[PDB]
Amino acid sequence: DREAALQERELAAKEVERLRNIVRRQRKDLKA
Amino acid sequence: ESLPSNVVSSAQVLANVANLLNIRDTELSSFLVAMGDISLRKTGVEEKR
Amino acid sequence: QGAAQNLPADVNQLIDQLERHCLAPDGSLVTKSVYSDLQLAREEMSRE
Amino acid sequence: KEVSAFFQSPDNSLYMLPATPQGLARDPSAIPSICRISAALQYPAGLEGS
Amino acid sequence: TLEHRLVVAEAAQKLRLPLISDGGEIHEEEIEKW
């Protein structure tokens, strides 16, 4: 199950990069 | 005849007892805190975490 | 090095737990009076 | 007679416009009004609403 | 006409109801009327 867990781990980890900068760009500009 | 008319007309609107809490000033606080910041309270820190 | 990492968390926890018991004193109610006032706005909305 | 009109003209009619309809802040010593909610006057007034 | 009956007529039956909280907030307009 490690290989099955490995393929879903990277997708569960790749989201962090796409869930920081867009948040760093939106919630900052949801204040104007 | 108009006592039961105008009184309930505001009263039926004023049945929204709960939603006023962010309406508090002029619905502007609702526009300021009911979604402007409470939905932003999480997302403000939902990147630093 | 490891103990130094916990120090910012260590200095926090010294008074953080007691500040719930410090909430009732004036150390918090100067701002946090709303809790002792039970939603100091108007106690939610009844008539105001 | 004369001084009353000298005082009525700038002080009488303009008084109600903030008096009842939130304008006076209704005892602005009522801080949570013009500090939490009715502070919306103070929110963009950089020179006034620090 | 009913707007100006708030001077004494409508002032003496329902205008003074919120005076329990309007110490000076409505005292400004009754002193216009008194």
Add this chain to the structure above:
Amino acid sequence: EVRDATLAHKAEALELQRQLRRLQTQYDLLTGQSSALIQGRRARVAATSAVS
């Protein structure tokens, strides 16, 4: 092992998942939430230039 790591990584995914939709909705709802009361200005200002 990675199955245990998935929990550390699903939390690394799920916890940050329900916040982008929040901001995206915010970027599509908060742009007009504040404007939903400015339109009342005209009704409140017409007679201001009258009694004065």
Add this chain to the structure above:
Amino acid sequence: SMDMADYQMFLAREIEGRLKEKCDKLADAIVDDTDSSTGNRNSSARLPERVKF
């Protein structure tokens, strides 16, 4: 006294309309929050879930 019977046409559009069409409209301004997308629920999304939200 004359304002008693004359109010048959006061409660037509003026004191029944403007009192009603602006009490709710201002009170329904709140739903322009997260509830803005669900425009049909705005009538029923004020009392039960705004305190929940």
